[PDB]
């Protein structure tokens, strides 16, 4: 049976009269996500994520009460196999090519600044602080996993280069100022298009969210859209000091290794190969 057939009692309750075979299921690290016209049903793919799901719901409720200039997935129903129904944010990612037009780029950079300002402000609220993960030593944990799990896969020069990147990383301040999305790639930012210029519809995939350093989200933006665009965002939002530029560079240079560390634990061979390009 499919995931759709297997989960069908719950689906007829949550989506009365909706043909399950007409839906689509996207997968992630922790959650099978059933995609309906205006909402998704999140289901745990492990015993670990089934236990964490209440807390994830609580977090999503906090995010739904922030002022970010856009939508987030709003919790519509939670239950116990636990499920969490979230609103589906409409729109699609922005193709990097759209940023060729300088009027589009200005408007898009403007909406990114609003979101990042909202996340920054939100991190100063004791309540959000109280509800959201704020790990200490998030990078020393990373560096140890890389040495343990990735170095054995790497050339001698790979290990040397990675060692340099991890050093830089150990020299960063353990800043916990902002709400940090943690994975703010292009595919996680949806837009309304074809109604004048692009308008930020909303942001999805908040599983990596934390109180942290916003340089992590800015680095992700630059990785998706390039340096001219990130310079535009940094200048519009007043974030183009050299200390910020250092944190951004340090974090970005970990992106290949983060992908490789995930693909290692996944059994994903293509992501691991891509991640390790130049480290072997």
């Amino acid at each position: 049976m499919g995931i759709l057939q297997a989960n069908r009692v719950l689906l007829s309750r949550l989506l009365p009269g909706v043909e399950p075979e007409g839906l689509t299921v996207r997968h992630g690290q922790f959650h099978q996500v059933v995609i309906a016209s205006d909402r998704v049903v999140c289901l745990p793919r492990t015993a670990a994520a089934a236990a964490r799901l209440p807390r994830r719901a609580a977090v999503m409720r906090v995010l739904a009460g922030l002022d970010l200039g856009c939508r987030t997935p709003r919790p519509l129903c939670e239950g116990s196999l636990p499920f969490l129904v979230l609103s589906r944010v409409p729109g699609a990612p922005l193709e990097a090519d759209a940023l060729e037009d300088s009027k589009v780029a200005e408007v898009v950079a403007a909406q990114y600044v609003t979101l990042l300002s909202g996340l920054a402000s939100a991190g100063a609220d004791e309540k959000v602080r109280a509800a959201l993960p704020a790990p200490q030593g998030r990078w020393r944990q990373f560096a140890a996993d890389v040495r343990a799990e990735l170095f054995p896969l790497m050339s001698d020069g790979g290990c040397r280069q990675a060692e340099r990147e991890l050093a830089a990383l150990d020299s960063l301040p353990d800043i916990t100022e902002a709400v940090v999305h943690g994975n703010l790639g292009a595919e996680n930012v949806l837009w309304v298009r074809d109604d004048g210029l692009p308008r930020l519809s909303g942001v999805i995939d908040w599983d990596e969210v934390s109180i942290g350093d916003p340089a992590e989200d800015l680095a992700a933006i630059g990785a998706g859209y390039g340096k001219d665009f990130l310079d535009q965002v940094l200048t519009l939002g007043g974030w183009s000091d050299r200390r910020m530029a250092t944190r951004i560079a340090t974090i970005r240079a970990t992106f290949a290794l983060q992908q490789a560390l995930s693909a290692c634990r996944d059994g994903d061979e293509e992501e691991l190969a891509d991640g390790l390009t130049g480290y072997r």
């Binding site: 994975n183 703010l184 292009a186 599983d207 992590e216 680095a219 970990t254 983060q258 992908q259 992501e271």
Partner: peptide
């Protein structure tokens, strides 16, 4: 927690 290079 950057996936796929972000």
């Amino acid at each position: 927690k950057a996936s796929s290079x972000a």
